[PDB]
Design a protein around this ligand. Structure first.
Ligand SMILES: [Mg+2]
Ligand SMILES: [Mn+2]
Length: 269
C-alpha cells in the first residue's frame, strides 16, 4: 500500500501511532512524507532517526523547517528556542542525520500513480519539466560540500515571479520559495510571501496556488503539506492538502492512495 502523511513537526509519538493504525509494513508498503519533519514538536531527533532508517520505503520532500534546521546546523542561522531542536543538534549522530537530510529531494514524482509531491505544492507558473529542473538544481546545491553558502543565499522574499531568464541568487531564492513557502498567488501566478491565513480570511485578490490552473495540476494529482491554516480543506479534485496541524494541537493525517482512505491521529499536545 501507499501512505501519504503531512507535516510531522517532531510529533514522533503521533507518527508511530498513525503508522501502527494502518499496519505500515516496510517492504510491502511505501510512505510519502510532505516534509517539515522537525521543529515545534518534541521529538525531532527520533523522527529523523526513524525516517532515515526506512530507506527506500519512504519518499520524502524537504520543507522550510527542514531547511532552517540545516541552516542552524551549518551556523548560518540562529536557533530559536521555540523550535525545540537542541536535542537533535546535540545528538552524537547529528552529523549523520543532517548530512542525510540535506541529500533528500524537493520533489517526488510517481508516473504510474500520476502523483506529484512537494512541500508547498507546484506553482502554476511551472510545467513538470521546469519543476524537475528546478528541484534538481537546488538539490545539487544542498548535497554539495558548499551547501552553507546556498542556505545563506536562500533567505529572501524576491523575486516572486518565475521566468526561465532568472539567473543566480534570485533563481535559487524563487525555486526555494515556490517549493517550500508558497501559499497564495496573485492572479498572474506571482507568489505572495506574507499571507498565511486560510483562503476565506485572506485579502483579495490573493488566491490559493491550487486555484490557478497550472500545467502540472491539469495532468497530475498533487499532494502537499505546509499550509496548516488550510486545515486540509477547500481543495479541488486532485489536490491533497495533508498538513492538518499536528504540532499545533490539530491532527496528523494519513492518506492511503489505493482507495483514497483517510486515517487520522489526534495530537497529544
Ligand atoms: Mg509545517
Ligand atoms: Mn512548511
Amino acid at each position: 500500500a501507499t501512505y501519504l502523511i503531512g507535516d510531522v513537526h517532531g510529533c514522533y509519538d503521533e507518527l508511530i501511532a498513525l503508522l501502527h493504525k494502518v499496519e505500515f509494513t516496510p517492504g510491502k508498503d511505501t510512505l510519502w512524507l510532505t516534509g517539515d519533519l522537525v521543529a515545534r514538536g518534541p521529538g525531532s531527533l527520533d523522527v529523523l532517526r526513524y525516517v532515515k532508517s526506512l530507506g527506500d520505503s519512504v519518499r520524502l520532500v524537504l520543507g522550510n523547517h527542514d531547511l532552517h534546521l540545516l541552516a542552524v546546523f551549518a551556523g548560518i542561522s540562529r536557533n530559536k528556542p521555540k523550535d525545540r531542536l537542541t536535542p537533535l543538534l546535540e545528538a552524537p549522530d547529528a552529523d549523520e542525520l543532517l548530512n542525510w537530510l540535506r541529500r533528500q529531494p524537493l520533489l517526488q514524482i510517481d508516473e504510474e500513480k500520476k502523483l506529484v509531491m512537494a512541500h508547498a505544492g507546484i506553482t502554476p507558473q511551472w510545467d513538470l519539466q521546469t519543476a524537475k529542473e528546478c528541484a534538481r538544481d537546488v538539490e545539487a546545491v544542498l548535497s554539495s560540500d558548499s551547501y552553507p553558502f546556498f542556505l545563506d543565499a536562500m533567505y529572501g522574499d524576491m523575486p516572486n515571479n518565475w521566468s526561465p531568464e532568472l539567473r543566480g541568487l534570485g533563481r535559487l531564492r524563487f525555486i526555494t520559495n515556490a517549493f517550500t513557502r508558497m501559499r497564495f498567488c496573485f492572479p498572474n501566478g506571482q507568489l505572495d510571501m506574507y499571507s498565511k491565513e486560510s483562503p476565506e480570511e485572506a485579502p483579495a485578490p490573493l488566491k490559493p496556488w491550487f486555484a490557478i490552473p497550472g500545467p502540472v495540476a491539469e495532468e497530475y494529482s498533487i499532494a502537499f503539506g505546509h499550509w496548516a491554516s488550510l486545515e486540509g480543506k477547500g481543495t479541488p479534485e486532485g489536490i491533497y492538502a495533508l498538513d492538518t496541524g499536528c504540532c499545533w494541537g490539530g491532527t496528523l493525517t494519513c492518506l492511503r492512495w489505493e482507495d483514497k482512505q483517510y486515517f487520522v491521529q489526534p495530537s497529544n499536545r
